[PDB]
């Protein structure tokens, strides 16, 4: 359970993300795909992209970055009371898109890296720990729905 102080740190940096959702979404998906190439293979939409330059030029990848960060932002602004928003996301990522929990750990590392790079004055170590905790809470609760459905592994 995050404290109110930890939520404030998370949502303070998140409001900075919201000034450039698309740019962040690009940088986070590119870092995920470069750091963990197995993740790119899960997207038939993107698996043609073979260089970072082709990634950065793809408008469809930039669109999907916005989709991902808009969904994450709506879950973070619920401060933990996010059951309605996670149900459908866990259901599609377990049963349709076939994404292991560990790749949600990987995209959480890429989100934390990109926020540190873009917002270092609002993303010191207090806020990095709080955002770590918020992304762990997201993973914990998606993993419980995976397990329900027979996909925790």
Q: Quick one: 24 or 119, whose CB is closer to ligand HEM?
A: 24
What are the structure tokens assigned to 78, written together? 């619920």
Among 45, 48, 56, 87, binds ligand HEM (CB under 6 A): 45
Nearest approach in angstroms of CB 47 to ligand HEM is: 10
Phi, psi of 2 (to 5 degrees): -75, 150
Q: How far apart are CA 31 and CA 153, in angstroms?
A: 26
Q: Quick one: 9 or 28, whose CB is closer to ligand HEM?
A: 28
Among 2, 71, 112, 143, binds ligand HEM (CB under 6 A): 71
Nearest approach in angstroms of CB 150 to ligand HEM is: 18
Q: How far apart are CA 124 and CA 119, in angstroms?
A: 9
Answer yes or no: is 97 a known binding residue.
Answer: no
Q: Single out the segment in contact with ligand HEM by CB under 6 A; choices: 3-11, 17-25, 41-49, 120-128.
A: 41-49
Q: Which 88-117 positions form the footprint of ligand HEM (CB under 6 A)? A: 89, 92-93, 97, 99, 103-104, 107
Nearest approach in angstroms of CB 4 to ligand HEM is: 23
67 lies in the site for ligand HEM, by CB under 6 A = yes
59-63: long-range contacts (C-beta < 8 A, 24 or more apart)?
61/26, 61/29, 61/30, 62/22, 62/25, 62/26
What does each C-alpha distance from 71 to 84, 102, 126, 138, 141 come to in angstroms?
Answer: 12, 19, 24, 12, 15
Binding-site positions for nitrite? 64
Binding-site positions? 64, 93
């Amino acid at each position: 359970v995050l404290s109110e102080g930890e939520w404030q740190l998370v949502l303070h940096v998140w409001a900075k993300v919201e000034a450039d959702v698309a740019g962040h979404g690009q940088d986070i998906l590119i870092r995920l795909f470069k750091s963990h190439p197995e993740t790119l293979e899960k997207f038939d939409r993107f698996k043609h992209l073979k260089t970072e330059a082709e990634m950065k030029a793809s408008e469809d990848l930039k669109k999907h970055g916005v989709t991902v960060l808009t969904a994450l932002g709506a879950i973070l602004k619920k401060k933990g009371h996010h059951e309605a928003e996670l149900k459908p996301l866990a259901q599609s990522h377990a049963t349709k898109h076939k994404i292991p929990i560990k790749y949600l750990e990987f995209i959480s590392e890429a989100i934390i890296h990109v926020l540190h790079s873009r917002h270092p004055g609002d993303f010191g170590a207090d806020a990095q720990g709080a955002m770590n905790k918020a992304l762990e809470l997201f993973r914990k609760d998606i993993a419980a729905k995976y397990k329900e459905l027979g996909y925790q592994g």
